[model samples]
Target: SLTLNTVKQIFRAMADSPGFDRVLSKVEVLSAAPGKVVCEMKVEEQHTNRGGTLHGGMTATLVDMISTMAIMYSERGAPGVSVDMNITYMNAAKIGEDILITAQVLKQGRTLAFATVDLTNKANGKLIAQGRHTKHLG
Candidate 1:
């Protein structure tokens, strides 16, 4: 039922989403637990900003989407929708660098859930971005 594969299946379905398919094309889920998930993404030219770095909006989307997937494991397979999110861009990720994103659930209550996500460079332990997300479970 509520398993890692379930989350992956759900995430994979994003391929069918209108504009989202383009954003998530290269994302891969590496691991998943009740309150945690690790994912990997290689920055492609298409995912970067005009400044030649990973786009801020893309980072925000990742934090919102992947962190919610972790919540699914603890919430009876229900991936809640985000109500709030705060993201901080710590460093720039150039095209071709691999990004490691770790999303963890901080709390999961009856109607709400809280989570945090950390984005780092894969080869080097450089912090790329951080995010806190709040979601409403239906």
Candidate 2:
């Protein structure tokens, strides 16, 4: 049976892989269970935009990775390739602020998995962004 600590180790391995995910190497898996995962990250200089707010692309990448992790928790297998991703930016998270990311698997099927992610300010609980992800399980 999968445990929260095991899921954290899995996420650490993925972040350690040499790729774009390395950008989020500082992200910490706070909680995990079947169909859900919660993560936290500090908005550092590398994650900031020109205006010193969290980069839009970084938010999208968080949605992608965390939602995939949620799918993996639910399916206990490969998260598969992304088929569609939609993100809505609501507020800004500045450098030095902590951001909380929560992802949930909405549905898991033989051929597809659907998930949603919410990004929020850890300090005051303001929503930062929301995203939906769809992946093809093959």
Candidate 3:
């Protein structure tokens, strides 16, 4: 069984592991429940592109990770391999700005899960990006 606290602990363990996600180690989980998760992170130099805005790759990575977390919470088991991912950038977040991410599982089936994520500017409530992810739960 999975509780919010256990999900959070799993997130911490992933963040503590050495990998590309280490760049997002500073992300703070604001709240979590079955099928849902909210997080916040400040855009730092490492997260920005040459234009001084949050990089598109970083935004997609956030979608990938947070959506996986939502699926894990919903299924109470390991997140499965991603089958498809789509991201649409709406606006840019500059370095030093805080971003809020909300992820929710849209549907959970016996062998697949669907999730969506939205990223917004914490200061102005502007939409930054939106994404959808599909995973095989086999």
* Per-candidate local distance difference test: 0.87, 0.91, 0.89
Error of 1 at 126 (Å): 1.0
Encode model 3's per-residue lDDT on 1-138: one tens digit a residue.
567777678678888888877777878888888888999999999888999999999899899999998898864465879999999998999999999999999999989999999999999999999999999998
lDDT of 1 by residue, 1-138 (tens): 466687677667774567665587788888988899999999998889999999998999889888877887874666888799999998999999999999999998888999999999999989999999999897
lDDT preference between candidates 2 and 3, better one: 2
In candidate 1 the C-alpha lDDT for residue 75 amounts to 41
After superposition of all CA atoms, the RMSD between model 2 and the true structure is: 1.2
Taking the candidates one at a time, how many backbone clashes does each contain?
A: 0, 0, 0
lDDT of 2 by residue, 1-138 (tens): 568889788778877989888888889999988899999999999998999999999999999999998898764476879999999999999999999999999999989999999999999999999999999998
After superposition on all C-alphas, the RMSD of every candidate to the true structure, in Å, is 1.5, 1.2, 1.3
lDDT of 1: 0.87
Which candidate would rank higher by TM-score, 1 or 2?
2
TM-score per model over all chains: 0.92, 0.95, 0.94
Give the residue spans of candidate 3 off by over 4 A.
Answer: none
Top-TM-score structure, candidate number: 2
Rank by lDDT (best first)? 2, 3, 1
Candidate 2: residue 6 lDDT (0-100)? 91
